[PDB]
């Protein structure tokens, strides 16, 4: 019954260093619905992370959108960490501005 989360990390707008933007963590394809999602900046938890209400898809599996305000820079590193019962340990996906 357990279905494993799929994650994309990406910005709302085309990223320009120094211009404020939103960073998204789109988490899909999971079951059961209980999930824990953290957004991280340089390895540290980001406070005040907006979380969409929970929804499910036509295949029954759940999805959720987390986002936060951020200003991209040349060297700041961002990630999304997901804890879920389908995986032994948490999954981290790092923001790649080319993807």
């Amino acid at each position: 019954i357990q279905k494993t989360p799929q994650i994309q990390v990406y910005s709302r707008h085309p990223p320009e260093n120094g211009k404020p933007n939103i960073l998204n963590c789109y988490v899909t394809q999971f079951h059961p619905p209980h999930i824990e999602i953290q957004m991280l900046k340089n390895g540290k938890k980001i406070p005040k992370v907006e979380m969409s209400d929970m929804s499910f898809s036509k295949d029954w599996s759940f999805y959720i959108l987390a986002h936060t305000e951020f200003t991209p820079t040349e060297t700041d590193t961002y990630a999304c960490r997901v804890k879920h019962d389908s995986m032994a340990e948490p999954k981290t996906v790092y923001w790649d501005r080319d993807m």
Binding site: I1, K3, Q6, Q8, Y10, R12, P14, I22, N24, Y26, T28, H31, P32, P33, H34, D53, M54, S55, F56, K58, W60, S61, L65, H67, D98, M99
Partner: protein
């Protein structure tokens, strides 16, 4: 177009004397328009699109009363399901429901839907005839027997052919729209004299889109990388597609974006 309405419902049981959590979400043309959540302060249906704000408090109270009905029917079902699968009661289970209708451009019912899943797995579903049930499961035969004996299919058929259709229409008139994609391609190094070309489509609504790469008029379905369409968070969507090509031969590849808001499909290439 092929207009649609859906209601997606979920009850999730919880350990330790708690009532199950019940969430219902309504969709008109794949966009969320209403939502009810039993965990809220004062549980009631709430509008989730601007064009629902014209409805009077009677509408909300009526929908809210239905939800309290569904909550209960879901709660008793969960209990029964636990007994059907010989499961213990320490734990956490889910019951989900999908209901709705598809309408044509002529406002005529194309297809009605009524499906259930237990713990994320198909349980029972009303067939396209709207008279028979397909049970996926040993336990779901129990349910199917009950509903055939009671004629429950008739009740759901009447809702799908009548109320669902009429209300979908009312909601469409209430809501009278696309956003075209802005596309561009980016260029990314690889090793061994190869390059990645990435075709981006951004800021588009609705979500449906097709992206193709061409080599000299022939479609590269084979080795194209493709991300799942994703929400931007502002009501629009994003997608991209990419191919690995030989260095110096970039101009031979064309990206095409197909979207219903476009006059013509977009056609573009890498532009250094």
């Amino acid at each position: 177009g092929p207009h649609s309405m859906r209601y997606f419902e979920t009850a999730v049981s919880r350990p330790g004397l708690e009532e199950p959590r019940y969430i219902s979400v309504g969709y008109v043309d794949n966009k969320e328009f209403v939502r009810f959540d039993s965990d809220a302060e004062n549980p009631r249906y709430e509008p989730r699109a601007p064009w629902m704000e014209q409805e009077g408090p009677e509408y909300w109270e009526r929908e809210t009363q239905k939800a309290k009905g569904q909550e209960q029917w879901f709660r008793v079902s969960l209990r029964n399901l636990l007994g059907y699968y010989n499961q213990s009661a320490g734990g956490s289970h889910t019951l989900q429901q999908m209901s709705g209708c598809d309408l044509g451009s002529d406002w005529r019912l194309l297809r009605g839907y009524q499906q259930y899943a237990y713990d994320g797995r198909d349980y029972i579903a009303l067939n396209e005839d709207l008279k028979t049930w397909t049970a996926a499961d040993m336990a779901a035969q129990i349910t199917r027997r009950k509903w055939e004996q009671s004629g429950a299919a008739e009740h759901y058929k009447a809702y799908l052919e009548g109320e669902c259709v009429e209300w979908l229409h009312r909601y469409l008139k209430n809501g009278n729209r696309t956003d075209s994609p802005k596309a561009h391609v980016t260029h990314h190094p690889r090793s061994k004299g190869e390059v990645t070309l990435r075709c981006w489509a951004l800021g588009f609504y609705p979500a449906d889109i097709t992206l193709t790469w061409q080599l000299n008029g022939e479609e590269l379905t084979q080795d194209m990388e493709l991300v799942e369409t994703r929400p931007a968070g502002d009501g629009t969507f994003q997608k991209w597609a990419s191919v690995v090509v030989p260095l110096g031969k970039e101009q031979n590849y064309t990206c095409r974006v197909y979207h219903e808001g476009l006059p013509e499909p977009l056609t573009l290439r890498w532009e250094p």
